[PDB]
Amino acid sequence: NYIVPGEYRVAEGEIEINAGREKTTIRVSNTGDRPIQVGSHIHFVEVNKELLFDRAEGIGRRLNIPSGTAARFEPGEEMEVELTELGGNREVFGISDLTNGSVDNKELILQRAKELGYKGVE
Amino acid sequence: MKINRQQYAESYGPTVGDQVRLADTDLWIEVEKDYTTYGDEANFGGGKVLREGMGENGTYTRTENVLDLLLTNALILDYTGIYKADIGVKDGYIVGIGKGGNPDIMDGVTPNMIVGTATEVIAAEGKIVTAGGIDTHVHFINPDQVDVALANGITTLFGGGTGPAEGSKATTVTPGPWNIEKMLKSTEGLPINVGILGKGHGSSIAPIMEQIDAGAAGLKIHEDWGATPASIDRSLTVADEADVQVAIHSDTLNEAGFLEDTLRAINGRVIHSFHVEGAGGGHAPDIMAMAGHPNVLPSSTNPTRPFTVNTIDEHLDMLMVCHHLKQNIPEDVAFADSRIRPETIAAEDILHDLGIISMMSTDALAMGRAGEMVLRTWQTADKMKKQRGPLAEEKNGSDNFRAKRYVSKYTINPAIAQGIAHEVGSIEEGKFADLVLWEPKFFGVKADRVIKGGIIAYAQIGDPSASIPTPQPVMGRRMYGTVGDLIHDTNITFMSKSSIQQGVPAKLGLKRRIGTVKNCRNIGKKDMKWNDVTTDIDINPETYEVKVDGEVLTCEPVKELPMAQRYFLF
Amino acid sequence: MKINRQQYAESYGPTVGDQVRLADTDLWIEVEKDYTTYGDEANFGGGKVLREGMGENGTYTRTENVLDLLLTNALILDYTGIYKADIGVKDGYIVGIGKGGNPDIMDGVTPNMIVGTATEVIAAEGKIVTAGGIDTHVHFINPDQVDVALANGITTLFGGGTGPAEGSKATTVTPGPWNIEKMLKSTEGLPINVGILGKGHGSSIAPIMEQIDAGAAGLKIHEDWGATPASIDRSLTVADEADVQVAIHSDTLNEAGFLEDTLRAINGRVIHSFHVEGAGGGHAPDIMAMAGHPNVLPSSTNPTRPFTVNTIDEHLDMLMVCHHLKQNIPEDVAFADSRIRPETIAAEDILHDLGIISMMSTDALAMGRAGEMVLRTWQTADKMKKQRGPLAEEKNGSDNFRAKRYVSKYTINPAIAQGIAHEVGSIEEGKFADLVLWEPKFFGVKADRVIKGGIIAYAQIGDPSASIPTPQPVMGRRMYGTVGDLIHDTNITFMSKSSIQQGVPAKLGLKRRIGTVKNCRNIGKKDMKWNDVTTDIDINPETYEVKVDGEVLTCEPVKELPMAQRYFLF
Amino acid sequence: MHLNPAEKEKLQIFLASELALKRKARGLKLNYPEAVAIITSFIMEGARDGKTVAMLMEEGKHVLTRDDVMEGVPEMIDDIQAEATFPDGTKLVTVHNPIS
Amino acid sequence: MHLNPAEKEKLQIFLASELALKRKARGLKLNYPEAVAIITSFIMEGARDGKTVAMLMEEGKHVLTRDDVMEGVPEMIDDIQAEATFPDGTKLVTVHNPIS
Amino acid sequence: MHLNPAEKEKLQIFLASELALKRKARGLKLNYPEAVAIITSFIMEGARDGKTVAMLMEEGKHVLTRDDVMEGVPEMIDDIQAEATFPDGTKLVTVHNPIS
Ligand SMILES: O=C(Nc1ccc(F)cc1Cl)c1ccccc1[SeH]
Ligand SMILES: O=C(Nc1ccc(F)cc1Cl)c1ccccc1[SeH]
Ligand SMILES: *[Se][SeH]
Ligand SMILES: *[Se][SeH]
Ligand code: NI
Ligand code: NI
Ligand code: NI
Ligand code: NI
Ligand SMILES: [O-]
Ligand SMILES: [O-]
């Protein structure tokens, strides 16, 4: 019965994030010579051009990590990450200007990615 | 991917079933429900969710379902529930309580809570958010009282006074058209919401009514002006015509009547009974019996709250000094002993816990503390939990029922009593964005940020010369919502319907938002949220023993309170 | 009759060839020229020159070449020169720099600098006079920050924020039409010039542009809102249409791109690169390479200025606390080590000295000190003189070249970058009379008097109850230019052309002078006064070694600074 | 620290009491504001020590005597009032005729 | 003296620390604002003495221990921050978990 | 207490002097505002003691010497002025070149 003012007594159990959404594991390589850190909610196909991965597997997806966290890639570092599905309307506008509409337009997204030198269009 | 509950609560604030201690009290509140979608929590910062094309929508203009302000991950404590949500503000009002972000990519986004180019963000994760406090017993005596009120989470001051004039030092009254006009103009510079009470005294209607038409928001009947059957009657006749509330401080002396004579003058009309326990004023010794009646909206003032070992000594002397009473004049000692009663102060604690006294208030600078209405509400709830145990209505070992009963006393119930609950008094969609953020460790003691009309007005923040705002000294300071013309848009002057229809704001050049007082004549005790009990309160005229339906109410005072010496430098 | 130079300087301030030490630094400024006529110096007091029929003209009405205010015998320190002159002010503007007095009897009187019945006098003999500082990286977090800025000679705050909301605590952004309107109204009460930045984020033009039309003076792109290629592009498209500046805090994380991707999005358009060294934010580790480009207007913020033995310890921890980083989480430590770099902070000192970084700024209350932009400019110049010697361009053993290079960094260059140099940023005829008087012993540390629009706004002055104004306590105090409606006439709200054409000032009831932002899209590095160098800056991605045209830039930190413990009580 | 308005003001009473106590220690008879500051600070420090309101009503009459203060000061001070945080929250102390 | 706004405010931290130190000397367990004032003033006086930021980050963890303060105070103070003029100008000191 | 504006401000000079005196006692050479605070408070406490203006004009030149203060401080202080209530009402004291 020591009192910590304003303390929490959390319930039992664990919180499952992004429940019911498809998960996908892909390997990603920072081919650049500077570090790249990627937030939880960036449309994964639109990340930095020097990240090498199967760009098609980033379409309509983002990192399956707690909201507001990030994955870090040191220069030359290759690792696996787990992606989850975007939700809501599954549309993306802005960021790298690869989508600007439905994420269902995979052909158009990959054509723009390839033109602009986003590594890993396969 | 799963997150344990300790780590989840640290990052986003607590979620369903988690409990949080209120300051250093023994009171625990439990999250009843959560509007989020786990994994799509909104947050702001470097690599965080609220970024363009991500949790921030980059397409929509402000008019297109975009917020001016999103409070992320708030733990709301309100009469309407204790729950986790994002709060969306637009045009100075609460427009959405739910889940904010970007429909492009997030599940479960409330349709009018889009984070867009136009949206500011306040992080409320790990904070408790309440409505601004509504203080309905304010003496306008010293303008320095406004920051004292803001620092303890008060956002609305209803009362009267012209400064440290004796009429104002005793009574919540701004008398007559001219003093009312002058104080409406003074109000243009006060960074808090205000409503002004006129003098509820006269034997003709016109001298009383002309105060309402001049811009008063209500009336105060006070024994120091003659709380006679005539003044009571004429004030309530005016109030019923004007749709404003009447507050009463009754005839302590029983000079023209006993309590039953005051109730007969009231004649079943609605009235707000101030300091209903009676140390602060009223028919000796039985005024507190008012709190049993269906047409009475009963409030306490704060120095009796809660009953402590120093309460009687402090009050007996306070009353002696204020009335210039002499310890060697037997009539003065008899008067004081009839007015300051351990029996009724002890029972007042229990009447609060039972929902028989509906409201708290200060009595700021007349017999009460401008910055301790919220503080003493929680000290009372904590003492009642310690002495009476969890209420029978509780579950999960939480104090949620008691917390909703007590938060109602200084938020929604005063607002309903005054006719202003359409604008203020709760965290609900469509109401003015008067919001108080609390760190749980400081809950009810020192507000972190006070939002007025959707802009921060007051904050505990540090050195203005520092690289970051957290270095010492951290103290309460007025923020940009109080500066220049923004003080007009972030605060409400509440006025009678007749003064508004007669163009008083334009006549006086008032720039503040104008609030209409309405709907406060066809309410009663049943309309007081979580505090709606009507019952027969008997106060023994010989012993001052209090009975509720023939059951004796005794309580003991406490020697120590939480929310006291751990926190305060003096 | 001859006067020796010691006696002359004591009476009238220094003249041609005389040198003056800046505070307790090793920097000396030399009087380049003097507008006076020896023997006809203006001065004011008992039996002095500015008396009716003598140095004061008794014939002319105010409209007839008469001044509202004459600053006598000023030592001007400005990008335009270091020289001795009288300064004449009329209608709140600098109308004459030359020789004031009475043409009746004095030789060499500048024709529109007549001292007449209408003329006030400020004695500037023995003072240094500069333009008011222009701070272009202000977070509006705590209104107490304005006096902190005035006390160190700042007169213009450009930035954003709504108070201590998280968006504002991280970013110089007032987002969307409503928050902009509210902060324009708040600005009516701030006794300093202000311009507000909107959120430079969106993938559609309209959400960004509606901020400009609402009264924003510019935009801020910040990584915390998504410093993506799209947000960069749309913001600069808006800026080019609206003729306002864009400030950038780039993608530190390199999430959507490296520096070359940000430069490609910019596509040769003008941009103001904030905290270009990068401790305050930007592409890790090479953001500082921005300062070599012709379309980049590069500023530093102040905590890295200059490089000292406590700089890294203070910043590493500051960054850890502000981002809630954990010393035991390797990604957090790697991020901090990539961002806080002794190599780039050391090189930043030299880049200032070489004229490759054009501007200083605070980052007030976000990662910078509201009252230390001027202070740290001079500490940097002093450290560079101590380590690198006099610049090759100097003569007479004076530091005039370095003093003009450094004074430009917080006066004229920010004003040019922002599109406001037609109104502010230098002591020139036709510009607003924002003037700071300094005692040389306090130069750059504590302003003596800050003149805003030709009326003193802020002064170091003593006991208000005393017989004379010099007795203790001498402290910074707001003066009559801040009081009542004079705050409107002595300060400028800078706004976009479109908001002015659309009548926003009338709509919001703004009474402040309204300044038009213009001409900031067809400028570049070449337009930065004394700081116009373009070059290839290479930052080694492995070692963070800095090279300028293939030459390594290393510097050492210092253990002590001037303008520090001799002056400050804490 | 989270200072509220009252905490900031009441620091100035402690400071005035420290000033007055130094003046008394070097042998000066105290004046009206010095005497009020000493008694006021004594009350607030007593509350902080956890004394009762009734103890401080008694003690505050014995902090300074008429020989400690200038002529007329005892009769200028009808009573001294102070609010401070006791263990049971803020309470008002009134000391009647503190200097006889 | 030429006091600027920060110099005026920071005098009040020194005063609050002197008040808290008197309370500690008469045997009271200190409360939240007392403890913050003592540690804060210690940091600013250390800067004035010419200590380094790194020295004060270490020392500020040893100024008060949990037995010096009331129950819960150690856990209420996550960190104390102060800016002061070092020999090399203003710097920020953050003391993490100053009272264990 | 009935404090007027000047009484409230001048408390801050006493406080700054107490701060500076603690710094001097632990062996620091004093800076410009520290030295001004010490001499100023000395003048106002001397008036309170009932010294003459002429006594304080003389004494204020002997409160601090050049070895008590940092390089340049003696030459930064041309004079120190203070008003205080003497037995014969408020008077101005000016100390010329207080530190030689
Ligand atoms: O009220 C108390 N007890 C009580 C009385 C009637 C009940 F029905 C229940 C309880 Cl616990 C109590 C017990 C001890 C001290 C104070 C009090 Se207010
Ligand atoms: O910059 C320094 N020296 C230097 C380097 C290249 C030059 F062309 C000239 C100099 Cl003096 C220096 C010398 C010692 C300490 C710091 C510095 Se920034
Ligand atoms: Se009531 Se004094
Ligand atoms: Se940034 Se605290
Ligand atoms: Ni009353
Ligand atoms: Ni009252
Ligand atoms: Ni930045
Ligand atoms: Ni910034
Ligand atoms: O009352
Ligand atoms: O920044």
Author numbering:
A (entry chain B): 5 to 126
B (entry chain C), C (entry chain C): 1 to 570
D (entry chain A), E (entry chain A), F (entry chain A): 1 to 100
Question: What do the authors report?
Answer:
Organoselenium compounds, and, in particular, Ebselen, have been classified among the most potent low-molecular-weight inhibitors of bacterial ureases.
Crystallographic studies on SPU inhibited by the most efficient Ebselen derivative reveal the molecular basis for this striking reactivity, namely, the formation of a unique chemical modification of the catalytic cysteine thiol, a novel mechanism of urease inhibition. The Ni-containing active site region is completely conserved with respect to that of the native S. pasteurii urease, with the dinuclear Ni(1)–Ni(2) cluster (where the two Ni ions are 3.7 Å far apart) being bridged by the Oθ1 and Oθ2 atoms of a carbamoylated αLys220* residue and a hydroxide ion W(B). The unbiased omit electron density Fourier map calculated before the addition of the ligands in the refined model revealed two positive and unmodeled regions in proximity of the two solvent-exposed cysteine residues of SPU, namely, αCys322 and αCys555, thus suggesting covalent adducts formed on the Sγ atoms of those residues. The unmodeled electron density peak located next to αCys322* revealed a peculiar oblong shape, suggesting the presence of two spherical ligands possibly forming a dinuclear Se cluster bound to the Sγ atom of αCys322*. Similarly, the anomalous difference electron density Fourier map showed an oblong shape overlapping to the omit map, confirming the attribution of two Se atoms, which were therefore both successfully modeled and refined with a 70% occupancy: Se(1) was refined bound to αCys322* Sγ at ca. 2.2 Å, while Se(2) was refined bound to Se(1) at ca. 2.3 Å. The electron density proximal to αCys555* revealed a different kind of binding. The electron density was successfully interpreted by modeling 47 with full occupancy and bound to the αCys555* Sγ atom through its Se atom (at ca. 2.4 Å). The mobile flap region of the determined X-ray crystal structure of SPU bound to two Se atoms was found in the open state, with a mainly conserved protein backbone conformation with respect to that of the native enzyme.
